[PDB]
Amino acid sequence: MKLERVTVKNFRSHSDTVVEFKEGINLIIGQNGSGKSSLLDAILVGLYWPLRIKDIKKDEFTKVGARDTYIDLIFEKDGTKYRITRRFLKGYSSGEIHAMKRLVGNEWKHVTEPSSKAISAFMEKLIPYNIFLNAIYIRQGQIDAILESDEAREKVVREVLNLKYKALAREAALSKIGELASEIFAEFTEGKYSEVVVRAEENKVRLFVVWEGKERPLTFLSGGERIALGLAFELAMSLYLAGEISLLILDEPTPYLDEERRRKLITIMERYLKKIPQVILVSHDEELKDAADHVIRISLENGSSKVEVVS
Ligand SMILES: Nc1ncnc2c1ncn2[C@@H]1O[C@H](COP(=O)(O)OP(=O)(O)O)[C@@H](O)[C@H]1O
Ligand code: BEF
Ligand SMILES: [Mg+2]
Incomplete structure (x- = not known):
């Protein structure tokens, strides 16, 4: 399994974030409360929504001031590239859409019905x-x-x-x-x-x-x-x-x-x-930078996470 790209809009402190992950140690470094664990938990939500984890709630994780949450994940598994896209509308749930596509040649094709249930069904078969x-x-x-x-x-x-x-x-x-x-x-x-x-x-x-x-x-x-x-x-x-x-x-x-x-x-x-x-790897410990292959710096600016590719 390999993570290629995570795109997050209005998820906790992230108003608009895109992270490219590569081979080797990808270190995400930043201070307390800058948005590191929110990115990882967005990955979790992206892959396995609906979750039944008590501290992750649809109506909480929508960024304050916004209505629509967007999570998009590109990943590889067993030689096939997959893309999961989730849109959440706070307070509501019927107008929200979930899709999972795969790269078949050049075209991206739905792997199943664009619905949480069917996607969950596929994802559980793909990676439990x-x-x-x-x-x-x-x-x-x-x-x-x-x-x-x-x-x-x-x-x-x-x-x-x-x-x-x-x-x-x-x-x-x-x-x-x-x-x-x-x-x-x-x-x-x-x-x-x-x-x-x-x-x-x-x-x-x-x-x-x-x-x-x-x-x-x-x-x-x-x-x-x-x-x-x-x-x-x-x-x-x-x-x-x-x-x-x-x-x-x-x-x-x-x-x-x-x-x-x-x-x-x-x-x-x-x-x-x-x-x-x-x-x-996610940490606030700066000492960990030198041993990493790729470093991404996150900080909180005016109420929103800012991500900076260092290497
Ligand atoms: N719904 C929300 N809207 C805006 N900001 C949020 C929301 N939920 C949490 N936050 C903020 O997100 C920040 C980043 O949290 P987190 O990613 O867990 O920090 P860390 O980088 O320490 O993991 C928190 O300090 C909090 O202020
Ligand atoms: F407070 Be965080 F998890 F660095
Ligand atoms: Mg954290």
Whole structure:
């Protein structure tokens, strides 16, 4: 999967924004409240509307002072270019239109009936929503979501790997993710933790950290460490699936991280994020600029986001 273009009109702080995304690490940098997460959440809305996420509401996200919201996304999947266009009219919903086209030769052609339901039906077959929310797009505040429970983790894993012996394949997959996560987390914590153990056990995927030679529960970690671990696991997952999904969208990776950890993050960008064909990384941390392949600066001007292509 590859994101080419996002166009947003009257979505939260964005009055009129166009962002071109490219291969490699695409860093979107800007201060608190400038419009970074609004762009990512516009991508989510663009792909999967109707959503049932409590903090994203049609009547809230229309930019104050405007009536019409417009989201347009161009992306590639499995060699085919796709375009989804959504127009929202606040307070109303019948006069609003949703279309999904594909590039067939030169002409763009509707892939289905231009309706939320049919598009959702197609999108779920193209890229399942759970894979997007759990494996592709890590929303702000959700870095540690994968540390939540053995069951939820089993659910995401099972969904992510899809369909001798299924169990052997599962063990091998989890083993590889565990290897990768261990390498990353050990780099992140300077050998404080020598392994991240990801283990299948009944309808559950256990997750432990090794400290002084023994497996420990996740409560063992400090807050910053849980951030590091979440990053490590999601990166391991993205790398394991690098050939299949090839995209990682990560909002603010720096919460609770001290100075050294923030420096290690750069090393991790350099060593690992560069192995994922496309990454969209959002942060207020300027230190992250040098390790990125493409930098987009966002700021708030007179009530509206302004986007500036740096590189
Ligand atoms: N409906 C709206 N109309 C105009 N501005 C909005 C609306 N909803 C939210 N905002 C503004 O959008 C700003 C950017 O939010 P966000 O993109 O979440 O910031 P960040 O760059 O920190 O992710 C907020 O600080 C808020 O003032
Ligand atoms: F306040 Be933002 F998410 F940088
Ligand atoms: Mg944000």
